[PDB]
Design a protein around this nucleic acid. Structure first.
Length: 69
RNA sequence: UUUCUAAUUUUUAUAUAUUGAAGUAAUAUGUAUUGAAUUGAAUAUUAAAAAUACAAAUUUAAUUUGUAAUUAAUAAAUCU
């Protein structure tokens, strides 16, 4: 999606990992809110995992096991 | 229809518009869950969960963008 706009996202991933590689239990899928301005300069907030991710952990169920009745 | 006359029924009757409301804004459970190659309100089914209002769409292979934001607009007042 950067390359749709010509941005070598090989950098952002590093700027991401400049903030997310430590601090974190392994395999914690975070949400990134990338926001691209008319100058193409992005600004991104990292956010705790989606609560649906939390919920399946706290009950120990994989994808497809849970459902509305 | 005796004849002159008089008379109250007439190839004259009323027809649906004012307004291509189109500016006013970044986000935040959430890309719910399931079924799914994929689906993020806009595949399929499923629809009474919430909170700090905007899930019956367009759009995209998916999203984001981008259109859209429940409003003044009184023909009725017979025309004879």
């Amino acid at each position: 999606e950067f390359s749709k706009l010509g941005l070598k996202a090989m950098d952002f991933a590093k700027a991401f990992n400049d903030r997310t590689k430590p601090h974190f239990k392994d395999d914690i899928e975070l949400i990134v809110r990338i926001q691209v301005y008319f100058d193409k300069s992005y600004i991104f907030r990292i956010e705790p995992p989606p609560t649906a991710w939390f919920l399946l952990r706290a009950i120990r169920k994989k994808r497809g096991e849970t459902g509305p009745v």
